[PDB]
Ligand binder design. Structure first.
Ligand SMILES: NC(=O)C1=CN([C@@H]2O[C@H](COP(=O)(O)OP(=O)(O)OC[C@H]3O[C@@H](n4cnc5c(N)ncnc54)[C@H](OP(=O)(O)O)[C@@H]3O)[C@@H](O)[C@H]2O)C=CC1
Ligand SMILES: NC(=O)C1=CN([C@@H]2O[C@H](COP(=O)(O)OP(=O)(O)OC[C@H]3O[C@@H](n4cnc5c(N)ncnc54)[C@H](OP(=O)(O)O)[C@@H]3O)[C@@H](O)[C@H]2O)C=CC1
Ligand SMILES: NC(=O)C1=CN([C@@H]2O[C@H](COP(=O)(O)OP(=O)(O)OC[C@H]3O[C@@H](n4cnc5c(N)ncnc54)[C@H](OP(=O)(O)O)[C@@H]3O)[C@@H](O)[C@H]2O)C=CC1
Ligand SMILES: NC(=O)C1=CN([C@@H]2O[C@H](COP(=O)(O)OP(=O)(O)OC[C@H]3O[C@@H](n4cnc5c(N)ncnc54)[C@H](OP(=O)(O)O)[C@@H]3O)[C@@H](O)[C@H]2O)C=CC1
Lengths: 338, 346, 338, 346
C-alpha cells in the first residue's frame, strides 16, 4: 500500500519535504532515494542543521558513500545533474518529487518517467499548460491517477487559492490585485551580483525588492471562475522565511469585515481545516514559522471600504507550509494509486 | 538713494528633539543653496557631546561632510556656524524669548497637540511646526505639493503630517484630479523606526513590541485617513495598514483605488509624469529604471512612482507603487514647509 | 521542600527564566509572582510568543487583572517600579530573581528583603564587591545559605569561567585577552539614538559595535587564581541571540590543540557535564540556540601558536544557556535552604 | 625646441570579472584626480545592460554620481568615456592583443595561478594583477605600504593579497619594527561576501553553506600566514580564523601578539600614529573617535586602528583592533598597485 518515493533536488524544498514527511504520524510514502550533488556529506549535514527549521531531532547518519540514514531508515543518495541517467527503473521508483526547479515541463519532468519512474510531482508552477496543477484544499479532488506529471503550484498560489475560493463562494470576486510581502529566497543574490532579473540581482538582506509573481493568474488554474480576475506583484524583504499576501478584491455582494472573517472561520472549521486558519492574536511573521496550514488569515487586519472593496491579509510559511502540501499531494497520489 | 536691494529676512529656528528627524532636518537645511532659515538652537538631553557625535556619524545617512566641532559646553559649530545646545525636557523652561526664536521644529513626537506644542509659544517662540500628525483636530496640516498654498501666517501651530501621508497625498492628488477616486486601500511596506523594539520587549502595541529586525510587523496607520486633511474630497474614501520590515530606511506605498474614469496603466503613468514635470517637480518623481529600496535613499522627492509596477484591473482598479525615503524625503519637506512660513512671515 | 519564588523584571531574562524553570523535569522552585509593568496582557503575550525562543508550548492564559496561568498554575502579576512596595511578606516570598538590571547593589537588591523576601539572586554582575558571585560548574559549591544576596554573574562570564578553569587546571594561565562576538541586546538602540555609550547608541542591526566587558576581570571573582590575568572587549553584531568567546591565553605548560581539546572533553564528560560541551561538527551560531550548556568549545577552531599561545573559541546562547544557570543557581539555594 | 614637458604615459587596463571588486575598482579609479591608468575594457557575462546597471546602482556603495550610459551593444560610457564590454568565460578568447591591453585586473577569483592568469598574456596582455591571494607560490605578492617597493616590471603576474592581509600587514609591520613579534593569533570579524549562501545551500565549506545574514559563521583564513609573504621575518609566527557576521561590508581584525620588547597601550598607539603621519599616510589610520563599523565605509585607508581598544597584558601581550572596508579600502589598494606597475612600466 506504500509507494516508493524519490526526491530530485535536495534544496530548501527537498529538505523541507523530507522533514515534513518524516514527521507524519501515518504515511503511504516510502522515501528511498535522493538525487543530489554534494553527496552524502552535504545531504546529511544540511538535513540535520538548518538556520530556519532548526536542528532535526532525528538521528541522521552517513552509512556509506551512497547512503544516509534517518532514525535508522536508509536512503540511497545519487548525484546526476541530468535526469536521464537516474536508476528509477532499477530502484522501482513510483513517484518522483521534482524540487530542482529546473525540470518543470513535460520534456524535462518526463525524463524521470523514461528512466523508470511512474509519476512526477513538480514542487513549482509548470511551464506547460498541459501539466495539471493542484492546490490541496481547493481542487485536489480533481486529481486522477492517470496523470503522469502534476504540479503543486507555487507557495504563493497555495496561500492565495484557499481564501480566494471562500471569497468567490460567499461574495463573488469581480476583479482584484495582490501584493505578497515575501521572504527572500535562494534565487536572490546576497550581495549585488549577476542576475537575469536586475532587481533580484540586488543584495537580498538589505533591500525591499519588487519582482513579478505568477500566483495571481495561476489561481485560475485551480479555480476556473477566477480567470483573468487577479493580478499582482511580490515584494521580497529581508526575512529568511514566512511571507504575507495582501489581497484587495472588488466583490459582488456588499459586506463588512466581520462577515468576511466569519466566512473564513466557517471554512477553517470545516472543509478547509488544516489548510486555512484564522488568527485572532496580534502576531508577527516569526510566529507563523513552521505552521502546517497553507494560509493564516490575520483577522484584525481584514478591511472593507465602500461596501465592496475587501482587503485580506494572509500569513504563510512559504517553506514549511508549502512542503506540507507537497506531502499532502503526494499522499493523494498514493491513496489513488492503481 | 535710488533704492535698496530686496532683502528677504531669515527667521530664527530652534529644533526641539534632536532625533532621526531632528538630525535629518539639520542636514537637509545645511545642504540648501538658499534658505530663509537660521537654525540657532537645538534642545538635546545629551548635551554637546551627543549632539555633535550623532550629527557627525549616522548609520543611515553616512558621515556628515561638514566640519562639526564642540565649541564649548552649550554650543556646537557646523562649518563654523555655532548653534546653542539646550537640554530641557520641559518646553516651558526653554529660552526662546531670550533667543528671539521665531519658529520651533517639534520633532520629539511628544508635543503634538495645542497644549504641548503651545508650551514653546508660552516660552517665547512665535510658531511651532510639528514633524508629525497633530493630535489636535483643529491643528492645520500641510503637505508640500498638495495644499501648502493654503498655509497662513496666522496659524501659530502647524503639522507637516506623517511620512506616509507625504508619499501618498501627492500621487493621490493626481489620481483624484485625472480619474476621480471612488474608494481605495493601501499598505505601506515600511522600514522599522525607533518606536519599535530591538528585541521582544514592552510596548503598548503588542506587534511593535516584537524584534524589529527579525519580523514583518503589521501596525495601524492613520496615513490613508490623514490624506483627507489635505485633500478634503477624499474624506472617508481611503484606509490602510502598515507592514514594518527589517530595513532601516526607505518605504513603499502600495495603493489600490477604484476610480471613476476607466483607464489603463500607461495613461495613469502619463498623468504622474505630467505632474512630475510640472506642478509637482521636486515632490513627485516617476522612476523608469528597475530599482530597489536602497536606491531611493537620500532622494529629495516625497514620492517615486515605480512606473513598471503600475497596474489597472477591470478598467477602474488602479494599483500604484511609490517609494519614499521616510527620513530624508520627509525632512526635506519639513525644511520646505518651514521655508513657506519664512516667506509669508508677518 | 519547595521554595516560593518571585521574578522581578519580566524582560528577556525574566521570561527566559520562567520558560527554563517550567521545562525542568524536577524542581524545588515554585514561582508564584512576577513584578512587572505592562501587566497581565504584556506578560501573558510576551511569555507565549517569542521571536528567538519561539512559541511557548504551554497554555498561557489571563486569569484576571492580576493573574496569569501557565498550564493551569496561577502566577500573581504585580506592577511596582520601586521594590520597597512589593508584597513579598504577604506572599511569603522565599527567593527573588532580580532580572531588572536596575537593583544590583545591596541597597537596591536588599529592598526586596525589607519588603519580606529572604534571599535575592541577581541575574547580572553585582555592583558591590561584598555581594558574592557564583558560576555553576565553577564555584557554586562555595555558596552558603547565610548569603542573603548573590550574583550569578554575566552571561559572558558564565561562558568563560568553565573553560578558563580547565585551562588553569591543566596548563596554567599566565595572562590572556578575550573578545566576545556577541548578539545585540536590549541595551542597544535600533536606530542611532541617545545612549550613555556613544557606540551602543548606533543602529544595532546594521553595525559591528565595540563595547566594554567586565567578564574577563569578573572571572577572578569565581576563580581567585585568575586575578589580574585577563582583559577583553565585546563586539556586538547583528544577530539576536547566541554569542562566541574568542580567548587567547599564554599558558605555563607548552601544549598543542588536541591536548587542549582533550582537557575540555574530560571536563565535559565528568565534572562539568551539562555545563561545558565540546562540539566536533562544523556549526554556526544558530545551531547553538536553546542549548542548555554554558559553553560549547568549537574543537576544530582550537589553535596553539609558539607552544604556549592557546586560542579557544566557545559558543554560548547568552539568553537560554545563562537562564538555565540562573535556574541551576536558584535550585542550589533551595537545596541548601534552612 | 628647448624641451618637451615630461609625459608619464598611461597604461591600458582591462578588468576581468565585473563583480564587487571589479566594480569597486572602476569607481575607485574614476575618482582619482590623477591616474596613469586608462580602463578601456571590461569582461562581463551580463553585457552592457548588467554592467551599466550594476555600476550605476550599488546597495553598499550607493548610486554612482557619474553619468553611466549604454552607448551601443558592446560599449558603455562613464562621464562620456567609453569602455568596451566583452563577454567571454575563457580568457584565451579575449581581444587583448587587438585592444593593446597592457595590464589586466583579475577579479574573477578563478584565474589565480600562473596557468589561469597566464591565459590573459597568451591572449595578448602584458601583465596580470590578481585581486586575491595567488594559488601559485612563485607568484609575487604585494601589499601597498608594506613591500610594494620590491615590485619589479619584470614580474608578469602579481597578487595584491587578500583584503584581510591588507589590513593586517601594515600595522603588523609597525609592531615588528618597534617591538618585534614572537608569535600571535588573530580573528577577523568579517562582513559576509558573495562566496556565502543566502539560505542554507550547497557549499564545499559546510559553514559557508549556512544562511549568511542570520549567522556568525566561522571560516578559515590564510591571511595571517599570508603576512609572511610580504614580511618574511613573520614566517611561522601568525595564525588566525575568520568570523563572518551579518553585515554587508566593513570588517575588523583583532590581533593578539606576544612581543619582544615590553610595552604599554599608549606606546603601541604612538608607534601607529608615527606610521600614520609619515611613511604609511593614506594606508594606515589611527581612529580616536568612538565609532562603529558603518563609520568606516568608503574609507580609503587599508587599516584604521581603534586606538581606545588597544590593550597590553602582562607587558608583552599586545591586542590591537583594526577596521577595514574590505571592498572599498582593498580596491583603492588595487588601484595603487596598478599605478605602481604604470609608474615602473618598461
Ligand atoms: N523556497 C521557497 O520558498 C519555495 C520554492 N519553491 C520552488 O521549489 C524549487 C526549489 O526552490 P529552493 O529549494 O528554494 O531553491 P534551492 O536552490 O534551495 O533548492 C535547489 C536545489 O536543487 C538542486 N539542483 C539544481 N540543479 C540540479 C540538477 N540539475 N540536478 C540535481 N539537483 C539540482 C540544488 O543543488 P546545487 O546547490 O548543487 O545546484 C539545490 O539543492 C523551485 O522550483 C522553487 O520555485 C516553491 C515553493 C516554496
Ligand atoms: N522616523 C521617521 O521615519 C519619521 C518619523 N516622523 C515623526 O518624527 C518624530 C520623531 O521621529 P524619530 O525622530 O524617528 O524618533 P527619534 O526617537 O529618533 O527622535 C526622538 C527624539 O526626541 C527626543 N525627545 C523625546 N522626548 C523629548 C523631550 N521631552 N524633550 C526633548 N527632546 C525629547 C529624543 O531624545 P531621547 O532619545 O534623549 O529621549 C530623540 O532624540 C515623531 O513624531 C515621528 O512620528 C515623521 C516622519 C518620518
Ligand atoms: N539579555 C542577555 O543576553 C542577558 C542579560 N543579562 C542581564 O539581565 C538583565 C536584564 O537583561 P534583559 O532582560 O536582556 O533586558 P530587558 O530590558 O529585556 O529586561 C528588562 C526588564 O526589566 C523591566 N524593568 C526595568 N525597570 C524596572 C523596574 N523599575 N521595576 C520593574 N521592572 C523593571 C523592563 O520592563 P519595561 O520594559 O517596562 O522597563 C524589562 O521587561 C540585565 O541586568 C542584563 O545585564 C545577563 C545575562 C544574559
Ligand atoms: N569582496 C571582498 O570583500 C573582497 C574579495 N576579494 C577577491 O576578489 C575576487 C572577487 O571577489 P567578489 O568580487 O567579492 O566576488 P564577486 O562574485 O562579486 O565577483 C565575481 C565576478 O567575477 C565574475 N566571473 C566569475 N567567473 C568568471 C569568468 N570565468 N569569466 C568572467 N567573469 C567571471 C562574476 O560574474 P557571474 O556573476 O556572471 O559569474 C562576478 O561578476 C575574489 O578573488 C575575492 O577573493 C579580495 C578582497 C576583497
Amino acid at each position: 500500500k506504500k509507494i516508493r518515493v524519490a526526491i530530485n533536488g535536495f534544496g530548501r524544498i527537498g529538505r523541507n519535504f523530507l522533514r515534513c514527511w518524516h514527521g507524519r504520524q501515518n504515511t503511504l510514502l516510502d522515501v528511498v532515494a535522493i538525487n543530489d550533488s554534494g553527496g552524502v556529506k552535504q545531504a546529511s549535514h544540511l538535513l540535520k542543521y538548518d538556520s530556519t527549521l532548526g536542528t532535526f531531532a532525528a538521528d541522521v547518519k552517513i552509512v556509506d558513500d551512497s547512503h544516509i540514514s534517518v532514525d535508522g531508515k536508509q536512503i540511497k543518495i545519487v548525484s546526476s545533474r541530468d535526469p536521464l541517467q537516474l536508476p528509477w527503473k532499477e530502484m522501482n521508483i513510483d513517484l518522483v518529487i521534482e524540487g530542482t526547479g529546473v525540470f518543470i515541463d513535460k520534456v524535462g519532468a518526463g525524463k524521470h518517467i523514461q528512466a523508470g519512474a511512474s509519476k512526477v510531482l513538480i514542487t513549482a508552477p509548470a511551464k506547460d499548460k498541459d501539466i495539471p496543477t493542484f492546490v490541496v484544499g481547493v481542487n485536489e479532488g480533481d486529481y486522477k491517477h492517470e496523470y503522469p506529471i502534476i504540479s503543486n503550484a507555487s507557495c504563493t498560489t497555495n496561500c492565495l487559492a484557499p481564501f480566494v475560493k471562500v471569497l468567490e463562494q460567499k461574495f463573488g470576486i469581480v476583479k482584484g490585485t495582490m501584493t505578497t510581502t515575501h521572504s527572500y529566497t535562494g534565487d536572490q543574490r546576497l550581495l549585488d551580483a549577476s542576475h537575469r532579473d536586475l532587481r533580484r540581482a540586488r543584495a537580498a538582506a538589505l533591500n525591499i525588492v519588487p519582482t513579478t509573481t505568477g500566483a495571481a493568474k495561476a489561481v485560475s488554474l485551480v479555480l476556473p471562475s477566477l480567470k483573468g480576475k487577479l493580478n499582482g506583484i511580490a515584494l521580497r524583504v529581508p526575512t529568511p522565511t514566512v511571507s504575507v499576501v495582501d489581497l484587495v478584491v472588488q466583490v459582488e455582494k456588499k459586506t463588512f469585515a466581520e462577515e468576511v472573517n466569519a466566512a473564513f472561520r466557517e471554512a477553517a472549521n470545516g472543509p478547509m481545516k488544516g489548510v486555512l486558519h484564522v488568527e485572532d492574536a496580534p502576531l508577527v511573521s516569526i510566529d507563523f514559522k513552521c505552521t502546517d496550514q497553507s494560509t493564516s488569515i490575520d483577522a484584525s487586519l481584514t478591511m472593507v471600504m465602500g461596501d465592496d472593496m475587501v482587503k485580506v491579509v494572509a500569513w504563510y510559511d512559504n517553506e514549511w507550509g508549502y512542503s506540507q502540501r507537497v506531502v499532502d499531494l503526494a499522499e493523494v497520489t498514493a491513496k489513488k494509486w492503481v
